[PDB]
Each structure stands twice: as C-alpha cells, then as structure tokens.
Amino acid sequence: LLQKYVTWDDKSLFINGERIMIFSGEFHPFRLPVKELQLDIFQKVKALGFNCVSFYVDWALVEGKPGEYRADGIFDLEPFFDAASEAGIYLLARPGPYINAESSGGGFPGWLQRVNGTLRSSDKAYLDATDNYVSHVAATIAKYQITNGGPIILYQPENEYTSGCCGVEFPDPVYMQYVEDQARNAGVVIPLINNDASASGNNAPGTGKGAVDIYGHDSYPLGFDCANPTVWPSGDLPTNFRTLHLEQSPTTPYAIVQFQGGSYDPWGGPGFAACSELLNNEFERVFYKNDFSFQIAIMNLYMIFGGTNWGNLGYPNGYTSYDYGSAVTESRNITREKYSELKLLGNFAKVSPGYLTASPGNLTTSGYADTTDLTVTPLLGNSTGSFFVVRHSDYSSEESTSYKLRLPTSAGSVTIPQLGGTLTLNGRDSKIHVTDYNVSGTNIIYSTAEVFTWKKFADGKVLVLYGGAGEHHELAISTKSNVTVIEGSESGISSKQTSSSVVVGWDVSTTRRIIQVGDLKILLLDRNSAYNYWVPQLATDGTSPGFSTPEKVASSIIVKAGYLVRTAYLKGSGLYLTADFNATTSVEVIGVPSTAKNLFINGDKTSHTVDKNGIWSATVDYNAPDISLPSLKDLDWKYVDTLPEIQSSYDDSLWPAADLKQTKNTLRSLTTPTSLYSSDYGFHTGYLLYRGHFTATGNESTFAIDTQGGSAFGSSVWLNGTYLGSWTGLYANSDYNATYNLPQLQAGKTYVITVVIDNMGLEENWTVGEDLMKTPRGILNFLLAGRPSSAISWKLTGNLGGEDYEDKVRGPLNEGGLYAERQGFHQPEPPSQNWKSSSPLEGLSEAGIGFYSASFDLDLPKGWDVPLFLNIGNSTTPSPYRVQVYVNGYQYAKYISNIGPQTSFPVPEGILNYRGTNWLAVTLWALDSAGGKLESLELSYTTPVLTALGEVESVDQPKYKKRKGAYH
Numbered sequence: 007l008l009q010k011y012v013t014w015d016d017k018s019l020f021i022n023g024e025r026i027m028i029f030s031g032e033f034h035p036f037r038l039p040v041k042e043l044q045l046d047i048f049q050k051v052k053a054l055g056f057n058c059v060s061f062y063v064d065w066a067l068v069e070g071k072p073g074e075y076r077a078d079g080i081f082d083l084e085p086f087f088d089a090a091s092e093a094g095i096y097l098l099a100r101p102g103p104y105i106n107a108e109s110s111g112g113g114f115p116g117w118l119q120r121v122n123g124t125l126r127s128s129d130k131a132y133l134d135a136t137d138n139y140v141s142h143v144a145a146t147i148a149k150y151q152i153t154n155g156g157p158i159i160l161y162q163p164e165n166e167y168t169s170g171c172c173g174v175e176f177p178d179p180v181y182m183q184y185v186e187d188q189a190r191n192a193g194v195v196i197p198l199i200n201n202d203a204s205a206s207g208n209n210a211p212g213t214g215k216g217a218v219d220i221y222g223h224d225s226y227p228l229g230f231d232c233a234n235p236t237v238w239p240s241g242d243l244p245t246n247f248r249t250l251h252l253e254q255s256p257t258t259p260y261a262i263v264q265f266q267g268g269s270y271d272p273w274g275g276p277g278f279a280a281c282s283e284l285l286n287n288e289f290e291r292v293f294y295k296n297d298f299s300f301q302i303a304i305m306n307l308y309m310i311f312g313g314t315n316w317g318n319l320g321y322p323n324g325y326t327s328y329d330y331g332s333a334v335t336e337s338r339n340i341t342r343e344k345y346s347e348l349k350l351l352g353n354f355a356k357v358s359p360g361y362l363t364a365s366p367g368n369l370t371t372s373g374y375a376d377t378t379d380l381t382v383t384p385l386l387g388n389s390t391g392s393f394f395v396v397r398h399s400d401y402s403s404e405e406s407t408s409y410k411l412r413l414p415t416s417a418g419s420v421t422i423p424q425l426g427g428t429l430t431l432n433g434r435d436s437k438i439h440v441t442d443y444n445v446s447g448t449n450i451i452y453s454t455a456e457v458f459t460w461k462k463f464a465d466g467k468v469l470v471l472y473g474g475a476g477e478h479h480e481l482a483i484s485t486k487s488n489v490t491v492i493e494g495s496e497s498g499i500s501s502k503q504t505s506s507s508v509v510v511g512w513d514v515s516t517t518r519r520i521i522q523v524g525d526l527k528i529l530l531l532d533r534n535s536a537y538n539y540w541v542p543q544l545a546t547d548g549t550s551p552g553f554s555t556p557e558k559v560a561s562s563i564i565v566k567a568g569y570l571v572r573t574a575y576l577k578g579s580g581l582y583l584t585a586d587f588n589a590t591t592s593v594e595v596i597g598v599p600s601t602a603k604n605l606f607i608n609g610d611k612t613s614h615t616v617d618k619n620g621i622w623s624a625t626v627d628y629n630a631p632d633i634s635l636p637s638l639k640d641l642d643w644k645y646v647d648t649l650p651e652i653q654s655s656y657d658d659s660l661w662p663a664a665d666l667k668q669t670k671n672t673l674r675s676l677t678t679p680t681s682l683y684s685s686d687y688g689f690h691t692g693y694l695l696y697r698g699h700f701t702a703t704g705n706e707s708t709f710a711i712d713t714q715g716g717s718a719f720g721s722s723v724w725l726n727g728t729y730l731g732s733w734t735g736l737y738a739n740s741d742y743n744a745t746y747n748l749p750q751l752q753a754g755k756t757y758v759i760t761v762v763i764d765n766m767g768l769e770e771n772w773t774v775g776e777d778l779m780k781t782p783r784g785i786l787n788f789l790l791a792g793r794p795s796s797a798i799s800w801k802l803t804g805n806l807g808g809e810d811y812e813d814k815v816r817g818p819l820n821e822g823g824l825y826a827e828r829q830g831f832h833q834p835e836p837p838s839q840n841w842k843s844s845s846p847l848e849g850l851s852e853a854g855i856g857f858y859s860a861s862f863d864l865d866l867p868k869g870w871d872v873p874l875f876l877n878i879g880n881s882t883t884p885s886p887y888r889v890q891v892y893v894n895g896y897q898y899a900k901y902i903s904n905i906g907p908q909t910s911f912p913v914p915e916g917i918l919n920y921r922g923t924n925w926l927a928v929t930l931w932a933l934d935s936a937g938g939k940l941e942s943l944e945l946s947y948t949t950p951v952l953t954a955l956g957e958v959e960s961v962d963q964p965k966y967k968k969r970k971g972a973y974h
C-alpha cells in the first residue's frame with residue numbers, strides 16, 4: 007500500500023520481492039536494560055534460525071510524568087534497533103499504547119487513573135492522553151523502518167483488542183482507526199498487524215473502518231498450570247486454525263503473533279523451572295510443528311527471552327523474575343533442551359521455501375499413514391515439494407507407535423519404507439516428512455528423517471538429517487548415482503538402485519554416518535548430535551551476518567560445536583567463527599570456502615586438521631577461571647532506620663496532604679471524606695506511607711482499615727510508636743479489612759496513625775470498558791471507633807516528587823516512598839559514615855523497616871560471561887518479612903518470605919560492575935512484633951561461559967546526592 011519493501015499475498019510475506027517465513031521471538035528491551043546484552047539475545051535468536059524479534063514498549067516507563075516523554079539512556083530504543091540490525095534480525099514493533107505484558111498498568115502510567123474517560127476507547131480524554139506518547143514512540147519506530155534501511159518490518163497497534171463490557175460498543179471501529187492513524191501520522195508506512203486474543207476476526211481486512219493490513223491472533227493452548235508439567239489435557243491441541251483462517255482473513259498470510267513459548271508464574275506459584283518443564287522440548291516439537299500444519303507464515307513465540315521485572319515494572323500478580331520458562335533463560339543461558347529443539351525447527355524453515363507455496367489439506371487419520379493412531383496433515387506441492395506433519399491422533403500419548411507411509415511424489419506414489427522395516431513415532435513427538443524436497447537442483451524424492459539444513463558449496467552440496475533414537479528411516483534421491491558410506495559403519499545402512507533413483511535405509515545411531523550420492527553429501531544424525539550443529543551466515547563483505555535474505559541464507563556454513571555459534575565471516579585466507587563455550591568442544595566446519603587456509607575462533611588462530619572428506623576439525627579447551635565472589639555477610643553493613651515516621655519527633659509538615667474531596671478516579675467513588683487513592687496524588691509505585699492525625703477523646707478502642715496494594719500485598723499499622731499489627735499478605739487478597747485494637751489514649755492529646763502499604767503494581771486492563779487499571783492503591787475505607795471519619799486528617803507519600811520523580815536515569819517506577827528511598831540512600835556512595843554497623847542477617851527485634859548498605863568489589867576475568875545471583879535463604883518456615891534489594895541503585899529483587907517462590911535473583915553485568923565497586927542497599931520490613939532477619943544472603947554463580955561477547959559497558963549509576971525536595 008504505502009511502500010514496496012514489505013508486501014504479502016495469501017501465503018506469505020514478501021521482503022524485497024522474496025517470500026520469507028517469519029519466525030520470531032518476543033523480547034522486551036525494558037526487561038533487560040543493558041545494550042550489550044540485548045545484542046547477546048539477538049545473536050542467540052539468530053542462531054535458532056529465526057529472522058525476527060517482536061517487542062513491546064512500556065509507556066509507563068517512558069512517560070512517568072504527563073507531557074514528558076523520556077526514552078533515553080537505559081530506555082533508549084535506538085541501540086536496541088541497532089543491535090537487531092547488527093545481528094540480522096528484523097523487528098515487529100508493538101508499542102501499544104496498551105501492551106498488557108504482565109507489566110504494571112498493562113503498560114499504562116499510573117496517571118491514567120485520573121483520566122475522565124474509558125481506557126482503550128474513543129473517549130477524547132483517553133485518546134488525548136495517548137497522543138504525546140504515540141507521536142514520540144511511533145516516530146522513533148518510523149525512523150527505523152525497513153523502508154529507511156532499518157530492521158522494523160511490521161507494526162502492531164494496540165494489543166489483544168478482543169473483549170469489551172460495561173457499555174462499550176465493542177469492537178469500536180472509530181477507536182482502532184484512530185490508533186492506526188496515530189501510527190500513520192508519525193510516519194509508519196509498513197504493514198499493520200493485530201493480535202486478537204482468540205481467533206475472533208476482529209479488525210480483519212474487509213471489516214471496513216479500523217481494519218489492519220494483516221490479521222493475526224494469539225494462542226496459549228497448553229495453558230499455565232505449571233504445577234502439573236506432564237499433564238497435556240485432552241483436546242488442548244488446536245486442530246481448526248487453518249479452517250478459521252480461511253473464514254476470517256483468507257487474503258493475508260496466516261499469522262500467530264503470540265504463540266506460547268512459556269508461562270507466567272504468580273506470587274506463591276510453583277516457579278519458572280516448572281513452567282520450563284511444561285513448555286519443554288516436547289511441547290515445542292508437537293505444538294510448533296502443529297502450527298506448521300496450518301501453513302503458518304508469521305510465527306512469534308511469547309517469550310523467547312523473558313528477563314526481569316526490575317524496579318517495580320511488573321504487574322501485581324507476578325514477582326521479580328520474568329524467566330517465563332522460555333528458551334533463553336532470565337540469566338541469558340541457552341542450556342535448556344527446548345532451545346536446541348527449537349533450533350532444529352527454526353533451521354528447517356529457513357531453508358525450505360516450498361513450505362510456503364504448498365497447498366495445505368485437512369488432517370487425516372488414514373490414507374497417508376497406515377494406522378488411525380497417527381494423524382497426518384499434508385501440505386501438497388507439485389514441482390515445489392510436499393510436507394507431511396505426523397503426530398499421535400491423541401496428541402498427549404506417550405505410546406511408541408509403528409507405522410508405514412503412503413506418500414505422493416513426482417516419481418509416483420510410494421509405500422515407505424520400500425526396503426523393509428517400519429517407521430516409529432515415540433511418544434510426545436511429531437515429524438515433518440518431506441517429498442520432492444529441492445537441495446539446490448538435486449531432488450530428494452522423500453525423506454522420513456527430518457531436515458535440519460542443507461547448503462550448496464563450490465565442491466558439493468550437503469544435507470543434514472536427523473531422527474530420534476531407536477528409529478529406522480529411509481530416503482530416496484532422484485539420481486542414477488549409487489550411494490557410498492564415507493564416514494561411519496556400513497552396518498544398518500541398506501540401499502538399492504532403481505533406473506532413476508537410489509533408496510537408502512538407516513537406523514538412528516549416536517555415531518554420525520555420512521553418505522555420498524553424486525555431489526550430495528548427507529549427514530545422518532540422532533537428534534542429540536543435531537542439537538550441537540549451527541548454521542551461521544557467512545559474511546564476505548564485513549563481519550555482520552546481515553538479514554536472512556535468500557542470498558545470505560544460501561551463503562551460510564555448517565558448524566558442529568557446543569554451547570553457541572554466533573557468527574562466521576571470511577576474510578582473506580581466514581575463516582573466522584565467533585562462538586561461546588561451556589565445556590571442551592570439538593568444532594567441525596562443513597563447507598569451508600576454497601580460499602580459506604586458517605581458522606580463527608573468537609579472533610585467535612586455532613590449529614585445525616582436514617579429514618579425507620574435507621571437514622575442518624579443531625578443539626577448543628574449556629578451563630573455567632577462579633571466580634572469587636565476596637561473602638555478603640562479611641561486608642561492612644551500615645544501618646539506618648527507614649521508618650522514622652513512627653518516632654514521636656517525626657515532623658510530616660512537608661508531606662502532601664491527602665485532602666482531595668473528589669477523586670479523579672472514574673472507577674471507584676470515594677467511601678472516605680477525602681481521597682486516599684495514591685494515584686490521585688501522583689504516587690503509582692513502590693511502598694506507600696499514610697499518616698493519620700487526630701485528637702483523642704480518650705475513649706477510642708479500635709481502628710479499622712481497608713488497605714489495597716494488589717495481589718500478595720501487605721501492610722503494617724502503628725499508632726505513634728505502638729505497633730498495632732500487620733496484614734502479612736496472601737496471593738488471594740488484593741485488599742484486606744483489618745480491625746486493630748488501640749492502646750489506652752489520653753484525652754486531648756494528638757496521635758498519628760502510620761500505615762505502610764506494599765503497592766505490588768497497578769492492574770492490567772484486559773477487558774475494554776472494565777477500566778481495571780484504575781483499581782486504586784492505598785486506603786479504601788477506615789473507621790476510628792466512636793469518631794467521625796473527618797476526625798482524622800491524612801497525609802501521604804510514595805516516591806519523592808510523585809510524577810516529578812527524582813531519578814531520571816533509573817525511571818519513574820524504581821523507587822517507592824520509604825525514607826531511605828526518598829533521600830536517595832539506595833544509590834552508590836550514600837552518606838553512611840556515621841550510621842550504625844548492623845547487618846540484615848542480624849535484622850530487627852521488633853516490627854519496623856530497616857535499611858542496610860554495603861559495597862563490595864568484583865574482579866572477574868575478561869572474556870567470560872558469568873551469571874551472578876543474589877540468594878536469600880528460606881530453608882525453614884520463616885516469619886513474615888519483605889525485602890527489596892537495590893544493586894547500584896537499581897531494584898533487582900522483591901522478596902516476600904511467607905509467599906515466595908523466588909529466593910534466587912539474577913543480576914546482569916552492566917547493572918553489576920565485574921571489575922569495580924558495587925553497592926547493595928537492602929530494605930527489610932518485618933511484619934511481626936518480634937521483628938525479623940535474613941537467614942542468609944549470598945552471591946553465587948553458574949557455569950562460566952567462554953564468550954565472544956565484547957566488554958559490557960556499565961549502565962549509568964548515579965551516585966547519592968542530597969535531594970532538596972525531601973521532607974527533612
């Protein structure tokens with residue numbers, strides 16, 4: 007329409023006139039705010055065979071103050087976009103404004119609680135509120151469109167605009183048209199794609215006003231019950247997706263914009279380890295190949311890398327980790343078997359253009375395989391080849407099943423295996439069998455083993471096939487050449503020539519076999535060997551792989567290695583690889599260019615041998631360095647009381663008065679004389695403090711209070727210095743009604759109720775019209791027994807300045823309203839010389855909140871990617887306490903002793919300084935009259951990785967400075 011770089015037909019996207027299968031992973035830059043590690047992730051994605059990444063922008067982080075857009079420093083999108091270009095990864099941009107994403111407010115800044123209009127609607131007050139954000143973020147996206155030589159190819163307006171309620175006329179076409187025009191007006195010309203939460207046809211082409219260019223939808227078919235990771239409920243595998251697609255948007259390529267790549271996990275949940283078992287390699291091979299059965303052309307996995315909900319950016323139901331059980335873990339490692347499995351499928355799609363031109367058929371329980379226990383969905387092509395996705399009919403089945411295939415080919419139909427034996431599908435597995443598969447002019451008539459990759463080189467073609475252990479396979483090639491075994495044993499390999507073909511049968515073995523037929527060499531692998539193969543693009547005009555264009559895809563090499571192969575480039579007589587290693591690794595390169603005489607690995611010349619088949623071999627030794635981590639308990643811990651409010655000399659005269667008689671919140675009208683909704687006064691994040699002044703009659707007995715901080719929140723109440731009690735919190739409670747007994751008060755004297763409330767983050771806004779993001783935080787109701795409500799005059803604070811937030815570098819959400827946070831003591835080099843020496847492991851002997859500070863040096867070796875973790879002990883049932891940990895001023899742990907489950911908190915390099923000084927600031931809130939302490943506090947590490955990554959630059963870490971706007 008508006009440009010010619012990205013077009014489409016009913017089958018696929020075209021980029022620069024060439025078909026491409028978009029295989030994408032979701033990655034949120036705001037959850038990993040270190041630019042060098044962003045490149046790390048992009049390179050890990052590219053090594054999967056993927057060509058795309060989808061990303062959200064979190065409005066709440068970049069317009070914390072209305073009218074001040076700040077997407078600078080750690081929030082700058084431009085380095086993120088340049089990292090993608092550098093890695094050769096296209097981008098799908100999803101700036102919202104509404105993103106959901108398990109983020110606070112679902113992306114909405116807390117000041118939307120004051121907007122007089124329905125959120126995600128055509129009400130002018132909402133639309134007006136979005137204009138400044140979108141005109142900024144969309145302009146930045148516009149600058150980096152592929153039309154300008156950038157990486158961005160698709161744009162998503164809104165997010166899951168799918169369900170409405172409560173008076174809204176859903177779907178409102180005026181609303182979506184407006185959101186679409188905002189993007190266009192900012193210079194976005196690439197196609198717009200939506201992500202319907204279910205296949206409901208919302209905003210599909212042909213729906214008139216508000217229609218997007220390409221209809222997309224989402225799917226999380228395995229659900230989120232991470233507690234039972236082996237349970238695959240009956241009927242949960244989608245079977246009707248192509249049918250739905252042909253009804254809802256037949257003129258556009260089939261797109262799933264969010265397909266399950268993991269799961270969220272709430273406070274009190276089973277943990278992301280369990281989620282990684284549910285969405286493991288078996289889920290991938292069955293469910294992802296099932297999406298290929300619908301001829302999916304655009305496929306984005308949510309998430310490919312989850313990262314961390316640092317600095318309170320997450321929604322109330324989730325905790326600090328957003329590991330998500332995804333293929334790349336929170337600490338950026340790719341050890342999970344699901345990464346390697348995903349790599350196999352991703353690399354298959356990258357080299358199989360006939361997949362996109364084929365005609366998909368209906369699934370069948372007969373006619374292709376000889377048992378109804380199997381289901382086969384065919385994708386038929388004449389000249390361009392066919393594809394057959396095989397799985398168990400009951401998809402949850404762990405049975406081993408013998409079968410034979412009857413498949414059509416250009417050479418006529420054939421019953422396979424022709425030479426004897428049977429095929430096997432073992433349990434939770436799925437296969438894509440191929441017929442008439444083009445290996446650069448050589449026709450593979452059929453193969454039962456799955457294709458990993460193939461390449462054409464100067465001295466021949468190479469094809470890499472794999473099967474699971476215990477499987478027999480067969481292939482046939484259009485050729486009059488015989489077959490020769492050129493590596494490995496000839497036993498298990500059977501063969502026969504016909505007049506225009508050669509047929510070869512084999513059993514999967516842990517030992518590789520290589521066979522030769524004419525100029526085609528075929529590697530026959532087991533799945534676990536195939537896991538160690540890589541297909542980097544080979545650059546000949548620089549060091550960067552470039553995007554996955556057909557010419558650069560064709561010019562790739564095949565590398566057997568270990569943990570990771572990032573890049574490859576040819577320079578003079580040198581073949582350069584960049585790779586990471588977590589063990590001693592034999593490296594083999596297949597398809598070494600004719601001109602290459604030396605091998606370099608990460609810039610170092612590396613001895614190699616050449617075997618009789620022309621394969622380069624080398625060894626890279628892994629010798630982990632001494633990692634010296636300080637013992638956090640032995641540091642010089644400095645303590646200050648960060649609840650001075652409960653001492654009798656505290657002066658709150660500078661605090662904002664909670665004196666608004668009308669709320670600006672449209673969702674919930676006041677049930678108190680003045681608003682005690684935190685967001686009415688610009689406080690949207692972290693711990694909140696309320697102070698209630700009154701004069702006693704002498705006859706007060708109880709104080710009742712309804713506090714609300716979101717799921718798993720807690721609160722604590724004092725009358726002057728006297729602790730009244732706490733709500734220690736439950737995931738099930740987002741608010742709590744408590745009645746506290748008061749001590750004997752003296753008639754005529756003034757007293758102050760101090761209330762501390764944990765704001766877990768603002769609610770999402772999933773249903774349009776419900777306005778749940780407006781759910782307030784703070785105090786909803788109170789009753790001082792025998793006194794009118796107006797007897798208490800309230801003051802409150804959250805983060806200092808509220809929306810005029812102090813820390814422009816670390817963002818609007820990082821710090822809450824504790825005295826120590828207000829003063830900025832959580833930053834590097836606080837004024838702690840005169841403070842008391844006391845450790846969080848000694849802790850508090852009564853209810854309250856302590857603030858602890860210590861520095862420590864690190865001196866970790868260059869060239870090693872070492873994941874570090876903060877650990878808080880929980881070996882036995884603890885008393886109730888809450889902890890926040892700030893690392894160089896950045897909050898990277900929120901901990902609830904009685905709820906969990908997180909005890910291990912990763913902190914990335916860049917936030918931590920691996921060769922320099924670091925600062926820990928710990929808040930410890932005891933919700934128990936007997937106080938509380940940390941059982942243990944430890945730094946740890948996991949497998950050091952010898953890495954190709956460059957120096958990781960430390961992000962800006964502003965040191966402590968006296969804040970003139972503080973209340974002292």
Ligand SMILES: *[C@@H]1O[C@H](CO)[C@@H](O[C@@H]2O[C@H](CO)[C@@H](O[C@@H]3O[C@H](CO[C@H]4O[C@H](CO)[C@@H](O)[C@H](O[C@H]5O[C@H](CO)[C@@H](O)[C@H](O)[C@@H]5O)[C@@H]4O)[C@@H](O)[C@H](O[C@H]4O[C@H](CO)[C@@H](O)[C@H](O)[C@@H]4O[C@H]4O[C@H](CO)[C@@H](O)[C@H](O)[C@@H]4O[C@H]4O[C@H](CO)[C@@H](O)[C@H](O)[C@@H]4O)[C@@H]3O)[C@H](O)[C@H]2NC(C)=O)[C@H](O)[C@H]1NC(C)=O
Nearest residue numbers: 278279329335336337339341877881909910944946948949
């Ligand atoms: C890739 O990235 C991943 C995500 O970033 C990363 O996974 C994370 O790794 C960290 C660090 O290992 C994990 O934290 C640890 O979790 C341990 C508990 O889980 C283990 O045990 C379970 C029960 O059997 C298993 O279910 C579980 O397996 C599952 O999860 C695995 C991933 O971890 C996965 O591979 C499997 O497939 C499976 O799904 C798992 O094996 C926990 O024990 C551990 O705490 C100890 O270690 C800390 C030091 O590092 C201490 O600070 C802490 O106090 C604990 O140490 C104490 O306990 C041990 C005894 O059991 C002793 O060995 C210690 O010396 C110490 O003992 C003292 O204290 C004891 C009291 O507890 C006492 O008994 C002793 O006398 C003594 O006083 C830590 O929390 C985190 O959970 C993982 N996160 C996720 C999302 O998975 C992965 O590591 C990365 N991989 C690589 C290679 O980089």
Ligand SMILES: *[C@@H]1O[C@H](CO)[C@@H](O[C@@H]2O[C@H](CO)[C@@H](O[C@@H]3O[C@H](CO[C@H]4O[C@H](CO)[C@@H](O)[C@H](O[C@H]5O[C@H](CO)[C@@H](O)[C@H](O)[C@@H]5O)[C@@H]4O)[C@@H](O)[C@H](O[C@H]4O[C@H](CO)[C@@H](O)[C@H](O)[C@@H]4O[C@H]4O[C@H](CO)[C@@H](O)[C@H](O)[C@@H]4O[C@H]4O[C@H](CO)[C@@H](O)[C@H](O)[C@@H]4O)[C@@H]3O)[C@H](O)[C@H]2NC(C)=O)[C@H](O)[C@H]1NC(C)=O
Nearest residue numbers: 282283286288340341342343346534537538568569588949
């Ligand atoms: C350096 O980097 C390397 C990557 O480049 C990295 O290597 C990778 O390391 C991970 C582990 O961190 C490997 O994944 C594990 O592999 C385990 C071994 O099995 C694999 O290899 C075998 C051959 O050697 C294969 O036969 C095997 O295939 C079989 O099993 C598959 C998976 O179950 C199945 O799909 C196949 O069809 C086939 O049947 C497999 O390929 C593997 O056992 C382990 O699986 C468990 O953990 C996963 C989560 O991490 C789960 O998703 C999975 O379901 C398994 O869970 C079981 O074990 C857990 C304990 O960890 C429990 O929590 C679960 O409840 C469950 O336990 C039940 O069953 C157990 C088995 O009987 C039993 O013990 C329990 O009692 C209970 O009944 C996981 O997939 C990965 O393969 C490696 N990748 C490569 C390329 O090599 C290396 O580790 C890094 N090194 C360092 C030092 O950091």
Ligand SMILES: *[C@@H]1O[C@H](CO)[C@@H](O[C@@H]2O[C@H](CO)[C@@H](O[C@@H]3O[C@H](CO)[C@@H](O)[C@H](O[C@H]4O[C@H](CO)[C@@H](O)[C@H](O)[C@@H]4O[C@H]4O[C@H](CO)[C@@H](O)[C@H](O)[C@@H]4O[C@H]4O[C@H](CO)[C@@H](O)[C@H](O)[C@@H]4O)[C@@H]3O)[C@H](O)[C@H]2NC(C)=O)[C@H](O)[C@H]1NC(C)=O
Nearest residue numbers: 272273274275276737738880883902903904905906907908
């Ligand atoms: C340190 O160690 C200590 C000691 O071991 C750890 O303490 C343990 O922590 C556990 C996890 O927090 C805790 O278990 C929980 O107990 C409560 C009941 O008091 C229960 O609600 C929890 O189970 C639900 O919630 C979790 C998520 O928090 C879900 O994963 C789980 O599936 C359950 O979900 C249900 O309730 C939710 C809230 O209502 C719903 O959203 C959800 O849909 C589901 O609701 C259905 O079922 C409900 C009934 O279960 C029903 O009401 C509703 O109508 C729906 O049908 C979980 O059992 C242990 O009690 C606690 N143990 C001890 C001895 O104290 C501590 O966590 C550790 N700390 C760290 C940092 O690791």
Ligand SMILES: OC[C@H]1O[C@@H](OC[C@H]2O[C@H](O)[C@H](O)[C@@H](O)[C@@H]2O)[C@H](O)[C@@H](O)[C@H]1O
Nearest residue numbers: 105106107108166203204224225226270
């Ligand atoms: O990590 C969850 C992820 O969910 C996306 O929607 C979740 C929502 O959508 C499904 O299709 C289905 O309707 C529901 O079961 C499910 O809750 C969301 O778009 C994304 O931002 C994130 O929240």
Ligand SMILES: *[C@@H]1O[C@H](CO)[C@@H](O)[C@H](O)[C@H]1NC(C)=O
Nearest residue numbers: 389390391444445446447448
């Ligand atoms: C197979 O690939 C070769 C070389 O790329 C090409 O010339 C030919 O058109 C392809 N054949 C088919 C049937 O697609």
Ligand SMILES: *[C@@H]1O[C@H](CO)[C@@H](O)[C@H](O)[C@H]1NC(C)=O
Nearest residue numbers: 487488489490491501502503
């Ligand atoms: C093809 O090779 C096989 C053994 O690999 C052999 O049995 C057969 O005779 C060969 N065919 C011809 C025509 O040489």
Ligand SMILES: *[C@@H]1O[C@H](CO)[C@@H](O)[C@H](O)[C@H]1NC(C)=O
Nearest residue numbers: 122123668669670671672673
């Ligand atoms: C919003 O606007 C209407 C019309 O001006 C007004 O009557 C109402 O009081 C407002 N509501 C809130 C919560 O500000």
Ligand SMILES: *[C@@H]1O[C@H](CO)[C@@H](O)[C@H](O)[C@H]1NC(C)=O
Nearest residue numbers: 703704705706707708791792
């Ligand atoms: C004080 O309170 C008690 C119980 O609330 C009540 O019975 C009594 O009337 C009150 N005394 C005065 C002087 O108001």
Ligand SMILES: *[C@@H]1O[C@H](CO)[C@@H](O)[C@H](O)[C@H]1NC(C)=O
Nearest residue numbers: 712739740741742743786787
């Ligand atoms: C607390 O009381 C209020 C007002 O009576 C009620 O609306 C709210 O639902 C109650 N909260 C809980 C957690 O029961």
Ligand SMILES: *[C@@H]1O[C@H](CO)[C@@H](O)[C@H](O)[C@H]1NC(C)=O
Nearest residue numbers: 653654656726755756757758
């Ligand atoms: C209670 O605290 C306030 C200040 O927080 C103080 O001014 C007042 O005198 C205290 N009351 C008593 C009875 O000590």
Ligand SMILES: [Cl-]
Nearest residue numbers: 828972973974
């Ligand atoms: Cl202050």
